[PDB]
Amino acid sequence: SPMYSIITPNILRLESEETMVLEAHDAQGDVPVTVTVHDFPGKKLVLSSEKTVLTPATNHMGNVTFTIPANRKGRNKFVTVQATFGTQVVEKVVLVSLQSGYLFIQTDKTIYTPGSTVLYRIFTVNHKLLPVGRTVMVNIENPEGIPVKQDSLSSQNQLGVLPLSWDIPELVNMGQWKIRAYYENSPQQVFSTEFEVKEYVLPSFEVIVEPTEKFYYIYNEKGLEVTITARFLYGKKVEGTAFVIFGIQDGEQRISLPESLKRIPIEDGSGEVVLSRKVLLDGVQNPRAEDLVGKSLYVSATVILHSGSDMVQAERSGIPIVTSPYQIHFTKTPKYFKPGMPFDLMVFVTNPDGSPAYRVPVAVQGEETVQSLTQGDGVAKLSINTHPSQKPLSITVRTKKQEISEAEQATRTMQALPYSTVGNSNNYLHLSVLRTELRPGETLNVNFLLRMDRAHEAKIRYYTYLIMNKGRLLKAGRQVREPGQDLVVLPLSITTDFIPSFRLVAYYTLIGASGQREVVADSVWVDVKDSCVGSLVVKSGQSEDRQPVPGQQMTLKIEGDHGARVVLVAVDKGVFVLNKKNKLTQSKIWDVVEKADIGCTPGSGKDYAGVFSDAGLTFTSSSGQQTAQRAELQCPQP
Amino acid sequence: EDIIAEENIVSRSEFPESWLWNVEDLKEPPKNGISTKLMNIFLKDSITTWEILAVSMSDKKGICVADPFEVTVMQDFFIDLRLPYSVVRNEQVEIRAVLYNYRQNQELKVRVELLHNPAFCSLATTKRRHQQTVTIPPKSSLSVPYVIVPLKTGLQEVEVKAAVYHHFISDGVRKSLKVVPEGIRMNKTVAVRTLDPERLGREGVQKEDIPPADLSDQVPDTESETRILLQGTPVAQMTEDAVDAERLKHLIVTPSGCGEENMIGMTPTVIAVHYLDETEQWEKFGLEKRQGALELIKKGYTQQLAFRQPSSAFAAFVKRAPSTWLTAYVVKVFSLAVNLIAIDSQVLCGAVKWLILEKQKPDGVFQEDAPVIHQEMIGGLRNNNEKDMALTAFVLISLQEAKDICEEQVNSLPGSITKAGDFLEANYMNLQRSYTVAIAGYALAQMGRLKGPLLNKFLTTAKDKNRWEDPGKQLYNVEATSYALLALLQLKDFDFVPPVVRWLNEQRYYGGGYGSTQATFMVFQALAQYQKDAPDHQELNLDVSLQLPSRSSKITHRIHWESASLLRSEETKENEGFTVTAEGKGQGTLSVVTMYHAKAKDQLTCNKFDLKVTIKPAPNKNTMILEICTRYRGDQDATMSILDISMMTGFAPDTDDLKQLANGVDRYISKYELDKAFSDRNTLIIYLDKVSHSEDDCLAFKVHQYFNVELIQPGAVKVYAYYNLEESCTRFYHPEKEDGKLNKLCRDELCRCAEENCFIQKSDDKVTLEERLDKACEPGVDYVYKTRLVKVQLSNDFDEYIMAIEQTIKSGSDEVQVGQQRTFISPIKCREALKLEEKKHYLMWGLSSDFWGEKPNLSYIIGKDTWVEHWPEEDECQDEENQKQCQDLGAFTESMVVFGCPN
Amino acid sequence: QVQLVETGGGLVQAGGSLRLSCAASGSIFSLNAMGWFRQAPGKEREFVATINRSGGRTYYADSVKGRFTISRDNGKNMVYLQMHSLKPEDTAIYYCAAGTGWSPQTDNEYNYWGQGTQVTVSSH
């Protein structure tokens, strides 16, 4: 009997083109499909109605692109997605988020004086980071939360760039001011940025407070060594005196160490100062040194020129106290395994400041024979064979750094639960892929391993893989399998459409053990590097063997995409000495995209239904096989 | 002599903090998909590093943030004018012009000058320049201190020019600071008036006159800003909460049995889905359960047609007689079921077609033949005294739920409805049961008319004005109040509803059970209509428009429940009483706050330290002892502190004294300062490991005058702890000036500089009669008097010269008569320069800008533009030396008095 | 960058005079030092005269101290060197050079030089 299956994202967006892939498994002849989208709990309104036919030439594989119109308290809203294959109806109630995308706010400066003007731009993009034309509400509120200016712009035909400005009055509050913006169609998603209002003048030099290591080893007898670096904004070394004081920070309580106050000279733009281990322990009331693990250290330096004409304060905070220059994280490793099939550990090793650590050997305890090395992304793959058993898989990974003693090594333990199958039957599907920084232009060899009974493997002749990128269906295809090919390799072309990451979910279906229609699926989250979809570079358009002079003409070279609108700003680096928060970077853009991801898990689920839902997909068939209903916009919280 | 600043220096004026806020489009033809646009920009005057950030937006590529590109702008030699953000009016400060020399092995000799500005009081005047020559070793810098006093508020400008000797290199910096008045910024609340047009005011409008800012501490002639904050107060119109779906989980029933038993199981499932669909509690109840109950509703409609008689009527069995109540109740349940599931409409209209042909007497009465085997489902209609009027109202409600669906099928339906309504009105004022008035209170409010008295009897039969009650089982009364709620919601009345719904919720009746057919169906059909039509909030909609006489327009704001403009601030620099008109529904808050300059202590200086600085000529040309004593004002000793010492122009500290101070236990003088040359060392920092709070810590060192200068600028000493530069204390020292302050004359927070000469220095022999007339006939010269010095009131701040106006040679803007007296003021430094003697006569003229006090007590100031010439007596002119001057003065008077000034 | 072209030279008698005009490629404004240098046959290149950016300051060599007068026109991008009371020891190739302003009496702070022009003052 034929099983008709439909797949949509877990969450649908308004005015956004969502994709719905329609399949007709084990069927002959043409299959006409009428897809309709109605409201909920009613069915009176027809939000969209597209038609298509699943021809056997395409192996009954087609898609239908719809768009939920934005005709629209404090609760969730749903829609009825319904595709009628011939006379069989397969429907699924899908959660809908009232978002029309993202809003990124850029201010010309990070800090402003009373009386000056705040020039700020707002970039209106959708979930694909492409510019859109929407009505955007903008607010500027003081530290007291009182909105002092409210705007309402139309980004239509503006190429997703809304330039704005506001004159800060002279009689005004000091502190952290906010710029808050949200879409008119989705007013529950607000995007914000801060800018400080303060009375200042620009300093003439900057101060860099750099510890010799980006952490503090609690058993290091040398203490926390810090190098104070001061140089003028135009690139000349500073001579002066530095006042450096240390402190410990437990959560949000800061405890200054007055005994750590040192006055060091700044000779040739540099100076060094140490927080001894005894001063740290004495200042925090002589506890057992293990109690300080988990807390952080901050350093405050004040450099004064020997002339006394200018001075600058700088602070380096968030220096964690650790027992291991390394941290091990299983946040990229699946938490479910398939009994009898290899389990691929994705061990992520970081330095204490959060940056990925390079060339750090890691190994699983109890084996001593499986030992890998972390790549540039900080990830090391560890494939371990698992027993065909329903027992939990407790895994402890430790670093094996040569120059490091066993006390200073890092460790972390995770547990993986066995994938539950329907009726305790043991048919699985494993997707394995190497984990290193993947970039466009490369080909990804995706391995389709099949662990199942040999009395039915001849019935599986194709896998159906789907690719999820930025909450939409990018590519859905078929991986042909021949009888006896327990492993087939899908060479996937990684183009710029896969930035910043994507999910590959695949499944096979058959009628096997008791004549029961069985669907087996698996998914894997593949991270790609990261860059711009296009490109943008600003550099000098002149020889510039000369150093430019105040008032001198300069040629600027801008290289980018054809037809792109480039917006510019030039800021004095003395501004950043006063405030360097809320600056737009590409890394912050990818943070917004991944937080909006409707997939919650790096691997498979407890069953076939859990595989689709965890990857952010719905499944529904005429044979009753379907996924559980999803009614929460956010992911489950661990 | 050579003025090196003749270099025609155009001072640097552009520290914009950000610029290049431009928008460019890459229209050039791409090479390998990359378009390159060349852009000419003009760098600003700042000597720093610029960070240029570019962001691109593309139709086919999206948004891209470029990596920052840096541009460093520098010179070899340049001035860095370290100017503070703001300076208090009439407070003396020391700015720092730092001169940088990045030559590799060339020691520069620079002539640096502070340009005169009438807004400041400095050593630079209109006739005197503050020029000095300094030496800057290679790869070093020198801080040139300048002492100034701002004299007028606003954005004032400081310009410093410099030019190096023997090299064609020059530079100039022209920055500006803000001069803020001696007070401190302070904010006061003018008014807090709550807006409620339907509780305050009259005829639906509320007028609120706001008084102007009631300040009494304001510094005179200072700006104030009044901020008007209109903000709506959100409330949560009040509406009664829906019943928690956890208490309704038992209403999902699998319908079974015969014609009457199937409807008993179908009722709680249809009414539960109907109530949960309206309230949308499926998320908190289980979204998966909605489809299962939807199939049980289909299962009920499927098995009820098995007992639908071929006469389109309903009975318990296919051999049982049809019922008027059971047929009307299937119409009541099937009509409410159409909204969720539908199959056949001729079944619903077929029962209504039979309900009028067979069971409608032209009296309008519905009479029951009673084949209803289950008396459970009947509800309040069972055991009813007026069972005849209560049944006419029950069937009439069933026809209405199916009237919008069977209007074309049953064309005789509006006739039976009108007939049924006619029977109810007649005997409505004769009923004595609360159930009959309640069900026939919803039966005449539904698309019908209840007369004024009928509405009064319907509202007055509610005991405690919240519930309908009668002796009998409480399921009859809960059903009755449910009918009375659907009536209050059909009449669109909402003043009697809140206490009615509150009672229904406090009943805690969740349906289900024995004989609960009517009670479960009505209590959730009524509570669903309450959630379908309801006025979550209290409907905020305020149209508040403020009329201000400060402008020619009225700014209005529609404060909807919409969250776009919950609060909207309106700043008005004008301080005037304005009117606030507010009308509409809801509540709002109005906040009016005025910022202003409050006069207080200017006591904000030296709030953390005591500082005593004495300079004594205690005994290479000159050598004095600079003594500095400081004391911290805390309960404990202060931490590491700084002594920022500035030398008076022409002086440098003794090197051997500094080396002995650096050897101190609680002191530190950096090796950098000790290795400095004796000359070009006008600043110094002595670091203190601690400064006591109990005693004054005193240090002293000798200073030598290595360069003789005509004017000595006062040195300064500044104390502060390392963690707070704002909490500082500066004392000035200078031999022969009071507390290190530059000479100024102040009165009522208005000062004028007194560093000028003293008077026009032209000699009495180099001036001629024509030169006197040409000078005095200028329009700038306001007054020309012949005076007689009566008294000389000597004071330490300034000398007062009381002059009797002997003759009014040219009367100015001051109406003074012969014989009257006017006071002429001059600083004490001019006492020896003027050489004024009592009872002597003088020729005096000056500018109107030298007036001082008010008109009744007008004083004259002897400034750089005031002419003071000795007038010898008539007998004194007999000498040959005074012959020339007396011939000029006597002629000067006759030429001005008799003929005036042409042009 | 900027290059220079020297004109106004030629052959003259012992006692007479002539002025040399220096033409600039780009805007001579903001250029602090504009100097003239000469190199006699058999001798080294020596300093003649420098002029300020605005023209308010000049420096001359002792040999031609009271006989030459340097001037510039920033609006015309021109430098001049009026040579009066010539001597037979002034026969040299005259070079026009752009400078930075630092040490304007030495050639070590001039990065842009000109072609030069021949000024022959014969004893006949």
Coordinates of N, CA and C in Angstrom, one line a residue, chain B residues 593-680:
Chain B
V593 N 8.1 67.6 34.2 CA 9.4 67.8 34.9 C 10.2 68.9 34.2
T594 N 10.8 69.8 34.9 CA 11.6 70.9 34.3 C 13.0 70.8 34.9
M595 N 14.0 70.7 34.0 CA 15.4 70.8 34.3 C 15.8 72.2 34.3
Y596 N 16.7 72.6 35.2 CA 17.1 74.0 35.4 C 18.5 74.0 36.1
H597 N 19.1 75.2 36.1 CA 20.3 75.4 36.8 C 20.0 76.0 38.1
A598 N 20.2 75.1 39.2 CA 19.9 75.6 40.5 C 21.2 76.2 41.1
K599 N 21.1 77.4 41.7 CA 22.2 78.0 42.3 C 22.5 77.3 43.7
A600 N 23.7 76.8 43.8 CA 24.2 76.1 45.0 C 25.6 76.5 45.3
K601 N 26.3 75.7 46.1 CA 27.7 76.0 46.4 C 28.5 75.7 45.1
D602 N 29.4 76.6 44.7 CA 30.2 76.4 43.5 C 31.4 75.5 43.8
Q603 N 29.8 75.4 46.3 CA 30.8 74.5 46.9 C 30.7 73.1 46.3
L604 N 31.4 72.9 45.2 CA 31.7 71.6 44.7 C 33.2 71.4 44.5
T605 N 34.0 72.5 44.7 CA 35.5 72.4 44.5 C 36.1 72.0 45.8
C606 N 37.1 71.1 45.7 CA 37.9 70.6 46.9 C 37.0 70.0 47.9
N607 N 36.2 69.0 47.5 CA 35.2 68.3 48.4 C 35.9 67.1 49.0
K608 N 37.1 66.7 48.6 CA 37.7 65.5 49.1 C 39.1 65.8 49.7
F609 N 39.7 67.0 49.5 CA 41.0 67.3 50.0 C 41.1 68.7 50.5
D610 N 42.0 68.9 51.4 CA 42.5 70.3 51.8 C 43.8 70.5 51.1
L611 N 44.0 71.7 50.5 CA 45.2 71.9 49.7 C 45.7 73.4 50.1
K612 N 46.9 73.5 50.6 CA 47.5 74.8 50.9 C 48.8 74.9 50.2
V613 N 48.9 75.9 49.3 CA 50.0 76.1 48.5 C 50.6 77.5 48.7
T614 N 51.8 77.6 49.3 CA 52.4 78.8 49.6 C 53.7 78.9 48.8
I615 N 54.0 80.1 48.2 CA 55.3 80.4 47.5 C 56.0 81.5 48.3
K616 N 57.2 81.2 48.8 CA 57.9 82.2 49.6 C 59.3 82.5 49.0
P617 N 59.7 83.8 49.0 CA 61.0 84.1 48.4 C 62.1 83.8 49.4
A618 N 62.1 82.7 50.1 CA 63.1 82.4 51.1 C 64.4 82.0 50.4
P619 N 65.5 82.7 50.8 CA 66.8 82.4 50.3 C 67.6 81.4 51.1
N620 N 69.2 81.1 38.9 CA 69.9 81.6 40.1 C 69.5 83.1 40.4
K621 N 68.9 83.7 39.4 CA 68.4 85.1 39.5 C 67.4 85.2 40.6
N622 N 66.3 84.4 40.6 CA 65.3 84.4 41.6 C 65.2 82.9 42.1
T623 N 65.0 82.7 43.4 CA 64.8 81.4 44.0 C 63.8 81.5 45.1
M624 N 62.7 80.7 45.0 CA 61.6 80.7 45.9 C 61.4 79.3 46.4
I625 N 60.7 79.1 47.5 CA 60.3 77.8 48.1 C 58.9 77.6 47.9
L626 N 58.5 76.5 47.1 CA 57.2 76.1 46.9 C 56.8 75.1 47.9
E627 N 55.9 75.4 48.8 CA 55.4 74.4 49.8 C 54.0 74.0 49.5
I628 N 53.8 72.7 49.6 CA 52.5 72.1 49.3 C 52.1 71.2 50.5
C629 N 50.9 71.5 51.1 CA 50.4 70.8 52.2 C 49.0 70.3 51.9
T630 N 48.7 69.0 52.0 CA 47.5 68.4 51.7 C 47.0 67.5 52.7
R631 N 45.7 67.3 52.8 CA 45.1 66.4 53.8 C 43.7 65.9 53.3
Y632 N 43.6 64.6 53.4 CA 42.4 63.9 52.9 C 41.2 64.0 53.9
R633 N 40.0 64.2 53.4 CA 38.8 64.5 54.2 C 38.0 63.3 54.6
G634 N 38.6 62.1 54.6 CA 37.9 60.9 54.9 C 38.1 60.5 56.4
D635 N 37.4 59.4 56.7 CA 37.5 58.8 58.0 C 38.9 58.0 58.2
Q636 N 39.4 57.6 57.0 CA 40.7 56.9 57.0 C 41.7 57.6 56.1
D637 N 42.9 57.2 56.1 CA 43.9 57.7 55.2 C 43.5 57.3 53.7
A638 N 43.8 58.3 52.8 CA 43.6 58.0 51.4 C 44.6 57.1 50.8
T639 N 44.3 56.5 49.7 CA 45.2 55.6 49.0 C 46.1 56.4 48.1
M640 N 46.7 55.7 47.1 CA 47.7 56.4 46.3 C 47.1 57.6 45.6
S641 N 47.8 58.8 45.7 CA 47.3 60.0 45.2 C 48.3 60.7 44.3
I642 N 47.9 61.7 43.6 CA 48.7 62.4 42.6 C 48.8 63.9 43.0
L643 N 50.0 64.4 42.8 CA 50.2 65.9 42.9 C 50.7 66.3 41.6
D644 N 49.7 66.9 40.8 CA 50.0 67.4 39.5 C 50.4 68.9 39.6
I645 N 51.8 69.1 39.7 CA 52.3 70.4 39.9 C 52.7 71.1 38.6
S646 N 52.3 72.4 38.5 CA 52.6 73.2 37.3 C 53.4 74.4 37.8
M647 N 54.5 74.6 37.0 CA 55.4 75.7 37.3 C 54.9 77.0 36.8
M648 N 55.1 78.1 37.6 CA 54.9 79.4 37.1 C 55.9 79.8 36.0
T649 N 55.4 80.5 35.0 CA 56.2 80.7 33.8 C 57.6 81.3 34.1
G650 N 58.6 80.6 33.6 CA 60.0 81.0 33.9 C 60.7 80.3 35.1
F651 N 60.0 79.4 35.7 CA 60.6 78.7 36.9 C 60.6 77.2 36.6
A652 N 61.6 76.5 37.2 CA 61.8 75.1 37.2 C 62.3 74.6 38.5
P653 N 61.9 73.4 38.9 CA 62.2 72.9 40.3 C 63.7 72.6 40.4
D654 N 64.2 72.6 41.6 CA 65.6 72.2 41.9 C 65.7 70.7 41.8
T655 N 66.6 70.3 41.0 CA 66.7 68.8 40.7 C 67.2 68.1 41.9
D656 N 68.1 68.6 42.7 CA 68.5 67.9 43.9 C 67.4 67.8 45.0
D657 N 66.5 68.7 45.0 CA 65.4 68.6 45.9 C 64.4 67.5 45.5
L658 N 64.2 67.3 44.2 CA 63.3 66.3 43.7 C 63.9 64.9 44.0
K659 N 65.2 64.8 43.8 CA 65.8 63.5 44.1 C 65.8 63.1 45.6
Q660 N 65.8 64.1 46.5 CA 65.6 63.8 47.9 C 64.2 63.5 48.2
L661 N 63.2 64.1 47.5 CA 61.8 63.8 47.7 C 61.5 62.4 47.2
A662 N 62.1 62.0 46.0 CA 61.9 60.7 45.5 C 62.4 59.6 46.4
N663 N 63.4 59.9 47.2 CA 63.9 58.9 48.2 C 63.0 58.8 49.4
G664 N 61.9 59.5 49.4 CA 61.0 59.4 50.6 C 60.3 58.0 50.6
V665 N 59.8 57.7 51.8 CA 59.2 56.4 52.1 C 57.8 56.4 51.4
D666 N 57.0 57.4 51.5 CA 55.6 57.4 51.0 C 55.5 58.3 49.7
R667 N 56.6 58.6 49.0 CA 56.6 59.4 47.8 C 57.3 58.7 46.7
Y668 N 57.0 59.1 45.5 CA 57.6 58.5 44.3 C 57.6 59.6 43.2
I669 N 58.8 59.9 42.8 CA 59.0 60.8 41.6 C 59.6 59.9 40.5
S670 N 59.0 59.7 39.4 CA 59.4 58.8 38.4 C 60.8 59.1 37.9
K671 N 61.6 58.1 37.5 CA 62.9 58.3 36.9 C 62.8 59.1 35.7
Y672 N 61.7 59.1 34.9 CA 61.5 59.9 33.7 C 61.6 61.4 34.1
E673 N 61.0 61.8 35.2 CA 61.0 63.2 35.5 C 62.4 63.7 36.1
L674 N 63.1 62.8 36.8 CA 64.3 63.1 37.4 C 65.4 63.3 36.3
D675 N 65.4 62.5 35.2 CA 66.3 62.6 34.2 C 66.0 63.8 33.2
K676 N 64.9 64.5 33.3 CA 64.6 65.6 32.5 C 65.6 66.7 32.6
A677 N 65.8 67.5 31.6 CA 66.7 68.6 31.7 C 66.1 69.7 32.6
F678 N 67.0 70.6 33.1 CA 66.5 71.6 34.0 C 65.5 72.6 33.3
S679 N 65.8 73.0 32.1 CA 64.9 73.8 31.3 C 63.8 72.9 30.7
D680 N 62.8 73.5 30.0 CA 61.7 72.8 29.4 C 61.1 71.7 30.3

